[model samples]
Target: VAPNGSAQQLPQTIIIGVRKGGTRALLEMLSLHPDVAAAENEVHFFDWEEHYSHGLGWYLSQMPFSWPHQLTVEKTPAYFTSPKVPERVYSMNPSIRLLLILRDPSERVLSDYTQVFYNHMQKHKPYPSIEEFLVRDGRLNVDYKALNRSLYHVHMQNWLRFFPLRHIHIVDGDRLIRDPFPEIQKVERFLKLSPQINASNFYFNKTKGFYCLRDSGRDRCLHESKGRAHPQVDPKLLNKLHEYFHEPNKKFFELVGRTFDWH
Candidate 1:
C-alpha cells in the first residue's frame, strides 16, 4: 500500500537483458514457483518511460495486485541494455532486485539474429549465414538491428552503475539448459524467497526447447509453448562464441565477487 493509503510497491524481482540468454526459458522456470507472480511480456514500463509519468496508476494497472506478501516479478531483458532504462528504473524503484541471464556474447549474437530474421523480420530470404554474422567486425555492426549485438561488458556495466552487486544475480545461459533446478534455487536465495522445486527432473518438452518441471506426476509450464522448427548455428561459429565471451565472462565474475570455470 502507498504511504498515503493507496496501493504501495516494494523492490520486486526483474530479469534485465541479454535478450536471447534463455530468458524465456528462465522466466518459465521462475513463474512455476508458488511465491512468484510474474508478468508474461517485457512490460516495457521502464523502456517506455515517457509513457509512465502520465501516472504510475497506468503502470500499476498492468501489474498483478501487490499482494501483501508475495514476490511480484517481471522480466524485461531489453531493459538491461537500453540506454534510458537504468536511470528511469532506479529513479522509480531503486531497491528492485535485478536478475540477469548471460549467454556468451558470440552465441548471444547468433541467437539474437535467429530471433529477428527467422521469427519476424525474415521475408522469404535466408537468414545470414553464421560465418558472416560472427565476423566480430565492430565497424561493420552486422547486428545493429539487435542493438548491433552489443558487447556484454557494455550492457552489464550500465546496470552496475545503478544497482549494487549483491542485488543482482547472473545466470549462465549455457548451464541452465543442462541443469536448471540448481540455478532456480540460486535465484530463489537471491530474492530471499523460499524455493519450492529443483530444476532437474523437468523434461525439455516444448518445441522452443523450454525446460520445465513436475512436482510429482503433474506437468507445470507457466504458459503453453509450441515446438518450432528453427535454423541451426554452425560448429565453427559455436567455437568462436566460446572464445569471444571468455574475458567478459571472467569480468562478470570479478564484478559479482564469485568465480565459475566457463570451460
Candidate 2:
C-alpha cells in the first residue's frame, strides 16, 4: 500500500476547558508546533445536546485537515462545566488526553462576569455591576452562577470519575500568561510531542502586558478581546472572594495532588 494523501481525522487530543482560562493562548502557542492542527472555534459536541444529536460523524466534520501523523485538537470551553459532558467525552474515547487550562478561581470569577458583561453590552441589555452580582444581603452570594463556576473542586471531582488525574494535564493559565516557555515544555512532554516550540516562538508585548506569538515569518498578538481589563473592585469585597475560595481551592489542590500560586 502506498501513502499519497492526508485526510481529516477526529481529534486525538481535546482541551476540555475552564472558561476564561486563556485556553486560546495555550491553543495558539501549541499551534506553533508543526505537528498540531487546531480547530478554529469551540465545537459543542460533548456539551450541547443539539450538537450531540448529530453524532461523531458531524463532530469529525468540524475538524481541520492534516497529515495522519499530526495531532488534531479542539477545545469546547463549556465541556468542563456541564453535568453530562465528562461521560459524553469518555464514551467518545476512554483514553483521550484532556487538557484543562485553569487560573486563580477568584480571578476566574471576575473574568466570567466580565465576559457576560461585554456580551450584555453588545445587545443593549442591562447588566448589573460586579458587586451587585457578587454580593447578597451584605454577604457573599453563593447562588451567583459565575461564582459557582469558579469552584474548581466541584468541577474537577466530576472529571475524576471519568479519568485518572494523570490522564488530564492541567495548564496554569495565569503562569502561561506571564512565563510561557517552561509551562509549554511541560505540555509538549505530556502530549508526547517532540520538542518543537521554544522561547523564540514568543515575545513580550509591553503595550499589552502579555506575550504574543511569532510563527513562520510573521508576528501576531492575541486579539484585543483576549486581554480585557478586569473591573476594579473594593479591597473589602476582593478579600471576601479570596476568603470564600480558600477552602475550595485547598480541596481542588488535594484532588489534583498539587498546588498553584493562587491567592
Candidate 3:
C-alpha cells in the first residue's frame, strides 16, 4: 500500500490471545470480511524472542499482502499470556486494536492439554495422561503457565495497564462456536469494517460438530489439528478443576462486566 514497497507498514489489529481459545475460528471468520487481510500462520514476532529481535521489517515480511484501505490483522494466541507482549505491542503501535476470545477456564485447560497430548501421540513420543500432567512431584499442582492462560482476568488486567478497555474486544469463544455471526457482528462494529459478513456466510457441519465458514459458496473447514477429540478425564479431577477456578472465574466475570456462565 505504501508505494507497493515500504518498510513502515505494520498490522493494524492483532488477536493477542488465548491459545486453543477458538483463535483459529475467530481469524478464519474475520478473513471472510473484504477489508481484513490476515496472516495465514502466527508470526509470533512479539512473543518469540528470536523473531522479535529481527525488527519490524522482519515482522512486516510475515504479513499478508494488504491494500492501503484494508486493515492488516495477525493472531498469536501466546501474546495474551506473555508478560512482555503488551509492552512490545504498545511499542510497535500504541493504538493497535486487540481481539481476545475466551472460553470456560476449566474447558480451556483441558483443551490446551489435549492438543499437547495429541501432538505427543502423533510423534510417537511418550505422553503422560491428563492426571499425570496435572500432578507434579507427586502433588496435584495446576500447571502454572498452562493454567495461567485461562485466568482471563489476570491477563486482561495486564493489558488494561497499557490499553483502554474500549480498544480491546472480548469474544465468548463458547458462544462463537455455537453462534458465530452475532459475535462476529459485534467484532465488525468494533473494527468499523464493512458489513460484508452475515448469517448466511456460516453453515453448521454436523459431521464436524462445528460450524464451517462459507466462502465462494463452498465449505471452508478447519484443519485436522482443530476440533480434536479430548481424552476422557476423570470426573473427580474435572470437579477439582472447577473448584480451583471458581473464584478466578467469578473475578473474571466481574472484570469483563458480563457473566459467561462458566461452571
Candidate 4:
C-alpha cells in the first residue's frame, strides 16, 4: 500500500539477470527483509514476446504489494542476456536499479545444462546427452540459450548501453553461497535500506552443506531440489568447454574489471 492509501504498485528495483546463477537464492534472501517485497515467480515481461505486449499494468499486477517505504522487486534471469531487455527496462523506468548475479561461466553453462536435463528427466522427456547437446559436427555449437547466457561479457556489454555501471550491481554467486552475510550487507547498503538483516539470520547446515535461514525456533531452507548434485561429465567434455570459453571468459573478466577465476 502507498502512504496515501492507494493500491498502485510497481517495482523500483529489479534483479535483471544471470539465469541459473543463484537468482532464486538472491531473491529469496532479499525477500526475507522486512522492507522488501518480491514476486514469487519470474516475471519475464520484457523478454517474453507475449508478456511484452501486455504492457506495464500487467507487469505491475504480477508484483507483490509493499508499504510506501518498502522496496518492490521482480526477478527474471532471462533479462540479463536478452538483447532488448535493457532498453525496454530503461524505457519503463529510467531510474530503476538493476542487480545481476553471476557465477563462473564455465560452471554456469554446466549448471544450466544440468537443470534442463533434470527437468527432462522429471517429465520423462527424452533429451540428448550433455556432450551431444553442447557439441555438434566436431565444433562447440553454443548458439543455444544455455551456453550463450554464460557469455557474461557479451550480455553485460549490451546492458551497459542503457545503464551506467554504477546503477548495475553485480553479485558473485559463488561467494553468496560460501559467505552470504557480507554479500547481503552489500545489497542492503546498495538498496539504501536500513540494516535489519544480519549474520544471525543464517546458519551453516552440515547435512545440506549450505546456509539455512533462522527465524526464532523455526529453521527455513531451500527445498531438496535447490542444490541437487550435477550430473558428472566426461573430463574431455569439461576440457572442451574450458577451451571454448577461454576467450569469452577473458573478455568478461576485463569487462567487469575483475577475475571470476573461471578456468
Candidate 5:
C-alpha cells in the first residue's frame, strides 16, 4: 500500500510461499539482516478481497513508518496458492521482487499439518491426525496446493503471465536450512545487496543437517540453516509422501532449469 492511502503501489520484496517449509526461519533470518524489515504477521491482503471491503487504508496502517529505502516487506505464503493473487498483485505493483522458498513437498505437507494441529490445539481450528488431515478430500486439509495439489506450477505459471522469470527468486528450503551463508549470498545477489557477513566466526549446531544458533542470548534459528527430518512421521508414511510428490518435484526442476533429485 502507498502513503496517500491507495492500494495501487507498494515498494516491497515479498517471500511468497511454500508454507511450513522454513518460511518462519527464513522470515526470522531476513529480519535480522540490517536492510530487511518485515511485518509481524503474514499479511494476506491482496490475495483475497475479504479484507478489501474495509479499503486499503486499513491495510496501509499495518506497516512501519521508518523503513522505506531497504526491503520493507510482508510475506503472505497463501498468495502462492490463491489463483487471483498474480493478477491482483500485477495490477498493483509490477516491479516487486518475489522470493519463493521451496522444501521437499512431502516434508512441507507434514510441517503444514503440524502447524495446523498446533493451531487447532490453541482453539484456532479442529483436531485431526496427520494422516486424516492430509487426505485430499478431507475437510481438515488446508491444502496449500503448492505441495499437495501440485499448485507450484499453477503459482509460477500465473506469475510468469505477468512478470519475468528474473523478477522471481527461488531458494532451496534445504539449502537455507543447512548452510545459510551461501544461500544468503545468493539472496543478496538477487536483491542487489552487498554480502559481507562474517561467516567463519559464526557458531551453530548441525542438528539433523539443519543448523541452530543463538540470537540475542536466545537459541534462535538465525544460523540454523536447514530443516530436520520428522521423527514422528511413520517411515512408510514418509515413503508414500515421497512417492506422491516425486513427479511434481521433477517437473518443478524442469521449470526451474535445474535438478532436485528429491526422489
Candidate 6:
C-alpha cells in the first residue's frame, strides 16, 4: 500500500515527570497543538534497560505517526528520577526539550503513597499505611522512599549535569488542574509553536473538580484513579508533612528560580 505523508519521528520533547506528575495531563494538553503529535503511552526507553537495549530504531518505532511538519513527544514519568536517563537521552538528542510537571511536594507525597498503596492491594498484597511510611517513633521517617522522591531538588541535581534549567519547562501541576488554558499557552510559547490550544478546549467539571478537554468536538476526562481522596492522616502529622517539604521546596524553588505556594 502506498503511504500518505504521515510517518513516525523522534520526539523533540519529552514529558519527564514528578509526583507521578500530571504528565498524562501535560501530554494530553500539548497534543491539542496542531503541530504537535504525542504518543499516548509511556515508552521507558531512557530509564529502563529493556527498552533502551532495543536501540533508537525501536524508540522511534514507538512514536506516534504524524505529518512531517509536526513535532512528536512521548511521556515517560519515570525518566525524571532515573539516574541513567539524562545521559542516555543526551546521547540520543542533546537538544531535546523536556517537560516536568510538579505540584506542592507536601500533597505529592500522599498522592504517591495512595497510588502505590492501591497498586500493592491490587496485586492482592496489602501494604503498610501512610503513617507507617511517614512516621516512626513519633517523628518523621527519612527512610521513606516516597519522601526522598518528593525532594524535587534531589532529582533536579541528577538531571542538571546534562540539561540546563531552561530546556526543562516546569508545569505547575496544581494550576494546570485549576485552570489549564493559560498553563498550556505557556507550553506553546516554550515550544515555539503556534497557539491552537484554546480556552474552549477545556471545561470546568465541578463534579470531578478539574478541567476536561474536548478533542474533535468530543469531551473527555482523565483516568478515574486521578483526583481520588487521599488517605486521612493525623492533623498534626499532616502539618509535619507540609513542614518537612517547606525546606526542600525552598531549595527546589531556588534550583529553578521559580517560587510556588505550597502553604
Per-residue CA lDDT of model 3 for 1-263, tens digit only, reads 45665332488889988998899999999999988888989989999889999999999889887777888889999999998889989998889889999988888988998999888888999877888777678555766567777888999998988998889999889999889999999999999987899898999888888999888868888988888787787887777777888898888878778788687
The digit string of per-residue lDDT tens for model 1 on 1-263 reads 55644343433777876787777777778777777777777677778756556556666666665556767777777787788788887887888888888765655665666656665443666666545655566333345454344466677678889988787788877778777878888888888888676645487765536666676677765343222333565666556556655776677667777765553
lDDT: the better of candidates 2 and 3: 2
Model 3 scores a TM of: 0.93
**What is the C-alpha local distance difference test score of each model?**
0.68, 0.90, 0.86, 0.84, 0.65, 0.87
Give lDDT tens digits, candidate 5, residues 76-104: 78777677877777766788888888776
Q: Candidate 4, residues 48-157: lDDT per residue as tens digits?
A: 98999999999988987666777899899989888988899989988888889998777887788778788888999997877777778877777756778887899999
Comparing candidate 1 with candidate 2, which one achieves the higher TM-score? Answer: 2
**Model 3 worst lDDT run, 10 consecutive residues:** 1-10
Candidate 6 lDDT: 0.87
Candidate 4 off by > 4 Å: 1-8
* 10 residues in a row with least lDDT, candidate 5: 222-231
Q: Which of 1 and 6 is ahead in lDDT?
A: 6
The residue-by-residue lDDT of candidate 6 on 1-263, one tens digit each, is 11887888999999999856688888888998889999998899988888899999999999989988899999998889888889999999888888999988878888888888887877999789999888899799988988887889999988899998899999899888788898899999999998888899998888888888898879988887787678999999998888888888889998999898775
Candidate 3 backbone collisions, by pair: none
- Which model is ahead, 2 or 6, in terms of lDDT? 2
- Compose the digit string of candidate 2's lDDT tens values, residues 114-226: 88888898999999999998899999888998877788889989999999889999999989988999989999999999999989999999998899988889999998778
**What TM-score would every model get versus the actual structure?**
0.78, 0.96, 0.93, 0.92, 0.78, 0.96
Pitting candidate 1 against candidate 3, the one with the higher lDDT is 3
Report lDDT (Cα) of residue 45, candidate 6.
Answer: 91
**Pairwise TM-score winner, candidates 1 and 4:** 4
TM-score of 4: 0.92
